[PDB]
Amino acid sequence: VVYGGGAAEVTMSLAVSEEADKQRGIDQYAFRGFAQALDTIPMTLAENSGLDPIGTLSTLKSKQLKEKISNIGVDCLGYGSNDMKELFVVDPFIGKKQQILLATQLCRMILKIDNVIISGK
Amino acid sequence: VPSNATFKNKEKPQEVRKANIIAARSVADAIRTSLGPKGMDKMI
Amino acid sequence: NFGSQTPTIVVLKEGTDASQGKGQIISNINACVAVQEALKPTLGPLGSD
Amino acid sequence: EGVQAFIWQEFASALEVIPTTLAENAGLNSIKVVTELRSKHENGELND
Amino acid sequence: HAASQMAKPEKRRSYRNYGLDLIRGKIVDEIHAGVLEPTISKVKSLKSALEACVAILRIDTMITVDPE
């Protein structure tokens, strides 16, 4: 079980960006691209709700650094209480786990494509 | 927080600005290979 | 003798290509190198698809 | 401390294309150079 | 020619000014064969042939505009 509302992507985003400082090397920029990609889903939720994606993402990132509670997320219904526990929003973890696997493993095949041969219909 | 303030309309200019940046960066990519002493000439 | 045309007999049927000269065997080399051009970047674990 | 400051962060990174292109056209790795550029340009005021 | 650079000083040197005889299929001295070429012809040829190759090696992209 996990709690939705953009709280899962923000929690997993800061964990990847923290490892980028320890590893460094040539892959330091690889963890940054994966961390910025996870934040796109919470920022997309703020676009359809007419919010500021910058102010919303900065609040979620500052909350996870101050406290360890991962239940803070984006509210598109605007009932207040960014805590997902009070809003009851719940998502399956098996669903959110496949979102990262299907997105990462598909981009691995796309980036390997060099010569593109397309026949005429 | 939602449903209030204003809602954005005519979002095509948001796509027009993207189409203008992508088309301008595509031109800057061909000239980019000519930058610096290692650049190459462009025959037209 | 059956006509004023008197056509000239061609050894091979119309549509047959030519050969010999210079570069006929070279044409076969450039055909294999061009096919090799696609398979070269696919070599190695860092290669492409 | 403003949204204008967040734009200036992208303005500084946009100027890095010139030294990045110099390494790409010369065959050298751009990140390996920029990693040395950031360290040397911190102490040195100029000419690096 | 490979033995001409290593021919070393002491005329007995020789090893140079030799070329191909296409009629007889042998290597003979070009001085006695009566074949000579101006020196300036070699200087202007190598410089002109290089400028043609330098201009081509420097072209990354060819742009062809259709006529109006």
Ligand SMILES: Nc1ncnc2c1ncn2[C@@H]1O[C@H](COP(=O)(O)OP(=O)(O)O)[C@@H](O)[C@H]1O
């Ligand atoms: N009422 C809600 N409150 C907070 N977040 C929500 C709500 N409904 C959906 N979401 C978030 O929006 C995301 C997309 O949900 P939705 O578009 O309804 O289905 P799907 O997950 O198949 O795209 C989910 O990850 C969820 O966290």
